[PDB]
């Protein structure tokens, strides 16, 4: 059983192969292969694997992304296209227009899937032509991404994630002194614009209690909790507090530049670090690679286990396309991944999963034909996107920045 | 054979007649009655209307709305719920928060469906419980108001109207020399919220010519339309140029303080006209008139005939759900209208259709628990709703402004 | 313009070209083209078609299939895959077993539509590699044949015809004194397999005059339509009253024997006739011509007129499949065919289109895959099909009986 | 957290099995009381003194005077009750035969005039239910699947799951196949209760399809399908639709043989003499075709108590299961059973061929419905039409006539 990783100069590297470590207890590991355009910079992340796995599994290095995949039963794609300086413009860019810049988010979420699409394309391919391994994403947009791969490359054993399910579910899990698995989600929605509906620990139903712990400036109030009734992903507070979003994200560094340096410290450190550093926190992506590694572990078993997972609805959610990728709790067993049963979506949450999933498919669209046309149409129909008069120059701007990686006619 | 008309005292009643006598030749019309709860203004209106019908038909006037919808075969919404004043407190209020002010989108279409809703449901009641007669209704929010009768009050023989469709294909019509029934039109959205993808004239596919036309006549610059490919209702203009009509709205008097002058110049030259006066064009409802009378007559007919109007998808557009009410092409025949196949609706024009429908629906919703609470969400919902910071004041301000009218809790 | 007819040594092909003729006054018709793969049957009927046609348009035969296709505007498909002696085969083989043996309806129709597939395949393809024609079909099965070419080969321009809903309109028009445009129907299921749920004319609901009708009238009793509440097609009694169809076919001449006779007193007359004889009312094909010239007719100008037609659901009966196709009323325009709006189907309806569906699409699969096996599930899957003891022998007489057609390994 | 069982029908002669059962999971939940309701007070009183013996004080065993008494503090309510009894299923079987159709106990005719037997009685049960403990119903009663549908999507009382005991007896088999625990067993499993298909099957993970066909052209001989059956249409067929697509063979069978249901009373009244001295469950009782129908039971309560989350088949709403067939059916499907709640899992599309037989089938459960919430003659005989093994035109009306007048105690037609 080999497991390859796609971006392993990575500074949550040494988190997922603690989570790896943790799981191979229970499955067989035998080899994890890294694999980055960055040499220099795995080399060190890698390093500091090694004195973390200290010989209970095979680590290795490929120099090519085929020689990492060709005998992989899993492949994590953790890469990202552009890097920080791609994700600078992502946020600096749209401000210039009055608009939100966030990494996932809206316009910045735009260009980043522009940058991602081709890669992915060509990963995907090559993955697909050899080892047909489960490829378990969590590069952002992730998914957009993965409705990319499900829907057009038409890939099934891709699996998006992201964070925010795992560390719900974990603050539940503190909030009742419970277990993980002993919480259980109505939870619906696309990758950071999701909705809880109902919480479950241990089969009672403490939606009322997890309501009423929320309420004990740029949080949601009491009122908005009443009124609509759903617990809401944090970033949806992108779209329904843009003006405060607006104000904090455009009076400060961008975002990018300070977990730049969170990441050149947590560098510094791993050169000499027998233990995982504390530093490590102050990424808000942590908790990612557990989710990986949990995964994983549950695709390899025959127990049955629900994780939420970016995957095609298939009935989860009744009054939305069966066609629709979203982040939903799954069934997990033995290599498959079964969709359960939720009923009905509500018609607050229904707005904006029906309006970026449509944004998301004429990026797409625009992607594939590479028209410059349909990139504008596209941007106009996010609920973030710029107004008729900004979207071309917006448009160009993006372009521009991203030459090196999106080519657009 | 008997109309009904609701709202007699409106401006543009004698359009409407005028409209009548000219089908009174193709069928039978044997009495138009009139009721509206300001007897003094309609009077003025109806005795110009009795000049202009010269007995073709009998012209009556009812004290009741029952006395009016009991032995009427159609029945005619033309009423405005609250007035012109209502109108100015939808278009006024929504400003000081930095929001779109308009008759019919987004916030001030949001108070006015409150205001419309207690008075349709007593008004629809009542038909049903009498002559049981096809409702053909103007007055706005016009779609919104068809979902709530169609899909709530399951009151089938409501028929929601608009003047954006006849007025297109009137253009196209003078465009190509040709006649309204030549021009043929793959078209659909929600009232106001509405797309054509497709022109045909007599047969050909003339859309090229018509987006290359479109070139050469506030307005949508050339690269908008090779982008979308879609040709736009103008109201669209409200969320696509949203900063560029928030500017323009909030620096010029209120439309509906204009339209208060542009009728009190109608009413006095009302009292003496022999003709219908040029300046009934000033307002922006011109055509709706033939829209109804055609609608009526083809109603009349077993010919079959089509008209675009709003009333349940059923299969129109193959990826939006059923039971949408949607402004769409029909058949129309022999008291049927019957959708006709289309095919795929374009994602771009989906993200605002889906959007639009679950607020029109949430705001239902809140109208029929009458619930503060649930109006905060469907207010929230709107693509040109509040940002929760402003959500509370707002709603607070526009039940205030509407305490006659509706009492929510 | 160019109509091709294939199969043009019909015995019907006299009154296809009356119809043809009818309406050549109000569409321009430059010639027809005649193609069979029996020249001098054809010849006999095509010299009679001269005499009848009096160069009011060209009369060509051509050797080939391409040779017609090639510049034809519609194509009308008319041959009998196997001639009668493959309906013989049909009609007689299922009755040793028990079974229903009929030209179109249960095994009969399995059989006939295997001996179909192959060539409809290559015509389907030759046609859509040269002039992309709107195809007419008249060959049964037609409706199954239909099911094929729209989901399996996915020509879109294929229109399935049969007689029962024009010779069902004609007697509701004869009924009520008035024009067959004026009869409306709420009609659907399958190709010989459709329920009338509602009758119009001239916009009246005469559904209960037309019941009471049917009583003044192997017919279904009184009570049945009391019960059941639909007009159900004749060809329905093999369903409903299989012991009594069984009994029937099995102690009679076959009918292909018949119309074996039919047809060699037909040619005989053919030979010298100057207009057509009475004795084509003996075939139970009449009023064919009228619904494929009509239909014709309609495609080529842009008037818009309704024809009950065999196409993709798409809506017309709301809790059916958009892609299951159907017989239902279609509005007919400009070359295209538009599904209409018609509600619920009935429960009891939907219990036969359902099944025969089912079994319609396994038949295609057996024939693609060219399985044996395939095709032994499928003769299963009908409700007039062979119980699990006598389906291997069947299929292996079916097979031996239709080599020269079709091939299963 | 104390918690009550209530079975309704306790005089059934499968109640010691269901207790066995219960017993089994009571290591696994707390179990305070079983309290059981008859029609048959006599009846059930030899059945539940033995039960005793059996119980042994574990749990409480208390008989109740009423249908409200038995399920006003539960948790979960068992039906398990024949409504007419074996009279009832007598005129079911025989009463078609004439006519040269099907008489089965659940399939065809006779499950038509015993859904009409059953849904008055549910009717006034699942009220009674509802107003008081609103506990999650476990039904046995038959037929099931069309109880279900009925209850789901007409009475709509959601906690109502319609249970039977096919696929846990083909979870056994494959089980003992591959020498597994049940649980290690996930089969790609649908249709209607008694109309049921299985398209793939794995233990362990591993996909063993083929190795099961395999082995069933290896293992009452000229009434199973044969070889190329499989070959062909390669499915494995729930045995009832035998009657379907073997009906001249059934039909001859069942009208050259004694009526099931008079040998089940013989069999029956054998079990509860028997009954008044056992100490031990006797090995007759596998003579009923029931069997495993109590694990499936106490096995879908323990899991519904839990919260680990199980895999039980049941008959419920499609929920996207099946893409390809309506949410709104009523199937039997695999689903995600956790803690009082039922979720459906998806297994992709159908199959054409068990399609044609669940949408003729689904039909005519609606209109058997829809003629008996408007006790209606004339929809009744629309139903009885539809039904792929009903009556020709020619036979409809006298039929239904002898039907209603067999069951004039239990159901009025206008
Ligand atoms: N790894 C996680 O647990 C985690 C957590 C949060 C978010 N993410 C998402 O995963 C992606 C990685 O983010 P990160 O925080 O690890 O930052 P990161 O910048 O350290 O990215 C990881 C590595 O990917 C490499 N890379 C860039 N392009 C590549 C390509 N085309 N092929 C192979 N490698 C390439 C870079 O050299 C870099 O070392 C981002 O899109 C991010 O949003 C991951
Ligand atoms: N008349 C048209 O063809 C037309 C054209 C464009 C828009 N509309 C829509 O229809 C409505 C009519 O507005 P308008 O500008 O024509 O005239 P308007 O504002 O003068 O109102 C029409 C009449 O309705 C009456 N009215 C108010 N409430 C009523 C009630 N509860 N019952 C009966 N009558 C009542 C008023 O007294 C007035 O005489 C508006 O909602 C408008 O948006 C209508
Ligand atoms: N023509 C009509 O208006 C009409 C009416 C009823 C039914 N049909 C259907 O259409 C078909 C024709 O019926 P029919 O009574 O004329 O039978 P038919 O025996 O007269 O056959 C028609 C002609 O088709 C020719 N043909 C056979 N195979 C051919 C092939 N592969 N390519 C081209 N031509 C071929 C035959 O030689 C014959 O001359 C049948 O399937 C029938 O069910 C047609
Ligand atoms: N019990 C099982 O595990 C099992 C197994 C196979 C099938 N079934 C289905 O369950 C039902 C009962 O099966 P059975 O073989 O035990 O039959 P059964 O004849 O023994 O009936 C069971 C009990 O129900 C009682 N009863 C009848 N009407 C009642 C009513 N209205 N209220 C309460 N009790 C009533 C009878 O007195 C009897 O004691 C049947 O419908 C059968 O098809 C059950
Ligand atoms: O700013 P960062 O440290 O990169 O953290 C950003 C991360 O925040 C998490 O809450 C989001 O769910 C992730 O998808 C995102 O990658
Ligand atoms: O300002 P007004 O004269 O009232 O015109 C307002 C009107 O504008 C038209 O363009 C809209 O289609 C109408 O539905 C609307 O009511
Ligand atoms: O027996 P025949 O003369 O060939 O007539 C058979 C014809 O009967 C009609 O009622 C059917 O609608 C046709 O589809 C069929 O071909
Ligand atoms: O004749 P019986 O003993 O009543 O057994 C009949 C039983 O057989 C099983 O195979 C069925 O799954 C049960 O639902 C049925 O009731």
Redesign the interface.
Known sequence: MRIAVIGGGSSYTPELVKGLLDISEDVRIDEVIFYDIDEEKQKIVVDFVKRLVKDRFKVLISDTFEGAVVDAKYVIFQFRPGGLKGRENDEGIPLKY?LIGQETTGVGGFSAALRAFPIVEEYVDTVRKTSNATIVNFTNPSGHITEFVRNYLEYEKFIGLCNVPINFIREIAEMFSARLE?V?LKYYGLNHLSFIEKV?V??EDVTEKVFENLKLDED??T??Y????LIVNPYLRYY?????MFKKISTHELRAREVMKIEKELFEKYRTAVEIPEELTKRGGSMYSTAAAHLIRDLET?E???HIVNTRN???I??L??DYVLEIPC?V???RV??????KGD??A???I??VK??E??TI?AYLKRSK??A??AL??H?LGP???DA?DLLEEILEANREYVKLG
């Open positions: 009055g002993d259980f479950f241990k089969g949601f109030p009122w908005f009443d009124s609509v009734r329904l507090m843009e003006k405060k025959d049955g286990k629900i298939n009935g989860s009744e009054n396309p069966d069934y067993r033995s290599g079964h969709t359960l049963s939720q009923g018609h607050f229904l707005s904006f029906h309006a449509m944004y498919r004429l669209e046309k349909l504008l149409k106009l129909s609920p107004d008729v008069e071309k």
